[PDB]
Design a protein around this ligand. Sequence first.
Ligand SMILES: [Cl-]
Ligand SMILES: [Cu+2]
Ligand SMILES: [Cu+2]
Ligand SMILES: [Cu+2]
Ligand SMILES: [Cu+2]
Ligand SMILES: [Cu+2]
Ligand SMILES: [Cu+2]
Lengths: 335, 335, 335
Amino acid sequence: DADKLPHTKVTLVAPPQVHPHEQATKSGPKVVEFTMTIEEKKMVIDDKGTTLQAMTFNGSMPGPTLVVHEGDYVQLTLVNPATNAMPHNVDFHGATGALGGAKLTNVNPGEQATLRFKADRSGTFVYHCAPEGMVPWHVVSGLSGTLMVLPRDGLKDPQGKPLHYDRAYTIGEFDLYIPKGPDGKYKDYATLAESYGDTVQVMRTLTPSHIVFNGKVGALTGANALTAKVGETVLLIHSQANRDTRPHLIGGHGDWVWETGKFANPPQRDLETWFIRGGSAGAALYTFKQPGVYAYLNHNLIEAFELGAAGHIKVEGKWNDDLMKQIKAPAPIPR
Amino acid sequence: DADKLPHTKVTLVAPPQVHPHEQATKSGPKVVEFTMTIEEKKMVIDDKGTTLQAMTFNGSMPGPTLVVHEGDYVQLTLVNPATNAMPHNVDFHGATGALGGAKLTNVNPGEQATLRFKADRSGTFVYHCAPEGMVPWHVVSGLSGTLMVLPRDGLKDPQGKPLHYDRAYTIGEFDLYIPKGPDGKYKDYATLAESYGDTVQVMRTLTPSHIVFNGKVGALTGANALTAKVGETVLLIHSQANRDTRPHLIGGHGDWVWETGKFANPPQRDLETWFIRGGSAGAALYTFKQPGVYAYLNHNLIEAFELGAAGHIKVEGKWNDDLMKQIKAPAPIPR
Amino acid sequence: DADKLPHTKVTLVAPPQVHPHEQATKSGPKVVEFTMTIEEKKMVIDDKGTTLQAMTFNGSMPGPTLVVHEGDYVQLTLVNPATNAMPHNVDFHGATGALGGAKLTNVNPGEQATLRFKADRSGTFVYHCAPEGMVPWHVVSGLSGTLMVLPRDGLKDPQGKPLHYDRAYTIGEFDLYIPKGPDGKYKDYATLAESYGDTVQVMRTLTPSHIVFNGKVGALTGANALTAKVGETVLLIHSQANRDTRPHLIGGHGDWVWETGKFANPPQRDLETWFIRGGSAGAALYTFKQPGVYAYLNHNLIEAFELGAAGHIKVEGKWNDDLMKQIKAPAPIPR
Ligand SMILES: [Cl-]
Ligand SMILES: [Cu+2]
Ligand SMILES: [Cu+2]
Ligand SMILES: [Cu+2]
Ligand SMILES: [Cu+2]
Ligand SMILES: [Cu+2]
Ligand SMILES: [Cu+2]
């Protein structure tokens, strides 16, 4: 009986960070309380000033990552403030019944609701808005995130050996369908509702105009690059709520990867490129061995470099000549 | 010697049902006899009244599912009635040699042929028409289905434990390429051959006009929804002969999934969304824990909700408040 | 210390062949020396006479397959001849650091460089050119190939039983983006640079004009078909540096498949169709049981038969009636 379990509130943090949590824990099942607030906003998505009429959990794309342990209950209050124009709900892929909770969380602007569900399966799971009659529009406008359900004893390799990360990062990849006018330029809409019909038309062609990590071209670059050091293990959580992606770390690997995202299954090792099915989240472990600026990207290189599905990881530390060495620098072809 | 083995005739049933069969059997290898008849027919594929000049096994999309056990021989009589326009054949992915049997089953209208092959590998396999020079057209027009080859001792989890289902369902997903006229309306053809050049032109764009389960938009909805109850285990067989898909059960999971469809390989557990490669069939087991109407869909949500790749499962039984509970119904935000 | 290890030179061979190598070896780690030369060239890619302003490793698409053993070092000299227009480099997915080696191998026309890296992870790995600001263009123009890093003890099934092949074949699949003029005909460029802006425009649509094995429509057909015999085991290495593919052997199977291409992971068996993620190479074993001409293809059948992603394997030997038999040849339906 979940009603008689300990109840704890967790404060969420903005992507690419994940809120503080234990991996292995000695503690028993708890009801973990989260709150999220829908924010509809116009967002600049590229270095030309192209805007999206966006819909977000907590003002960000992706929504924040919620972390519990297997056997815990997730208890979410979803707030849809009167400042919004559309109704919303939430469908958790980690939950069982009522369309993921969508049937029980239909909130019109000015309303809120509270859902509890048992997180009885370990893994990274997508959550997204799913209002009947307009599911794809709400999802592609930015309403998705990840729930991570860790095993109580933490992550394990195929032989049951413990795997540990020093930092988790969360990347949400968003296929965007921005309409154009007769002049060939991207439309700019005064309101969210004005964007609807044209956006649906672009959606039906199945060709995204942009594909971005975390809400914009270059979101995870420059001052906002991910960071690490040699010897550090990172967990990279990657969600795509609508479309397939194929993550790749340039100069690195996926040491252990759950590409389907489910921790009771044995991970795969040494992956160059992995595969996140549209409507899922996956996770990769990597321990950095070389310093430098890595690219983390969708390995359809057109989608990465032309459409925006790429970020950076800046890594400090000592170069290893055993792993890689320049034997002869670029120089004239000998006579 | 396959000639001296027992012979049995099996009567096929229309999708989404699968003909009665044993899972684990004490029986030895048999030659199992099936007959199918190719039916070319004009089919209404959506609610606007759009038609496809279709090609079907037994008048349905997908063709019926054929079930045998590993070690059995499949003996199919393929009939191409005098009233059809085109030559046809059959290519079984479960078979070895002669292009899956296509080379041995070249039937013009007014002809029939009988092929035997050994089903020596367990799994769900695509079969489809493959007439020389005309393969993609015949496949996308509806000519595919599934052969399920069960292990003699039935399905097993990764640790060798027996897995039973109470009901198998078969879903065939079809990417359609319907031409449009200068007015931007879908073309309606008097004959199959009239539709050919225009369809190839759409196919080459690699963008489907429609993507449907079992022959039309909403085919597995309303009175034709799949049904189950709480406590029942269903096997969901999903085929896609031409294009990738990513099945998802909203409010449910894949308890045990063979996404590549081959039963000698350990399945994966707890999947939110799985992946069927174009040119293959996969299988998922799920045991229902909550009542209600579920959606079963391709989790590219545009393909599901805009293009038609979605169905329903109507489930009876008792709601489980432990697995999911509405703690606070949608209500005003406290001022 | 890698500098003190034995050094050997390897002579590469043109695809679809792979240079002579041991599977299991008693040899210890070695620095294995290769040299490749970038060749920019206009290439005829289809029957209609359509050309590509192509960029190639050693004049071929794909580049040749480099084969080492786990724990070896790869030492590549990359030559960019004085007669080329563009700067180049190489990114090995099998390497660790400096963007797969791309940062250390920036060669302008007239220059060369030598890179060493430890091949410490077994599997088939993509390598490709990756010049700053120009990555997708160079890759889709033909600059990719495979590095195969074999385990020292050769290939193993999931139970650890040895798996041996008689011949390895290497297939590179290339999605091409050829611009058209206002007349709807494919453009023919005098220079590589003239093709640039137009190609980027086609790339952004994400719709290939052609998808080819090994550099052109029908490259592995006719006199250039792959060959084999009944009882022979082949390894089929399949690489795709930019886009997903789904390999299928018509009338055959993947007996043991590493679809993510990493040999430390258990392979899967009996696959009808497998999946190569864009940005990876995979590998499949098959032992032939039937004679005949097989088709090896991308099982998006439009991409195979309309766009070019198909080849042939011609197989000699004795027909096996136990596996497949024509019981009744095509004949009039009985009246
Ligand atoms: Cl030929
Ligand atoms: Cu919403
Ligand atoms: Cu969903
Ligand atoms: Cu046909
Ligand atoms: Cu096929
Ligand atoms: Cu280059
Ligand atoms: Cu790469």
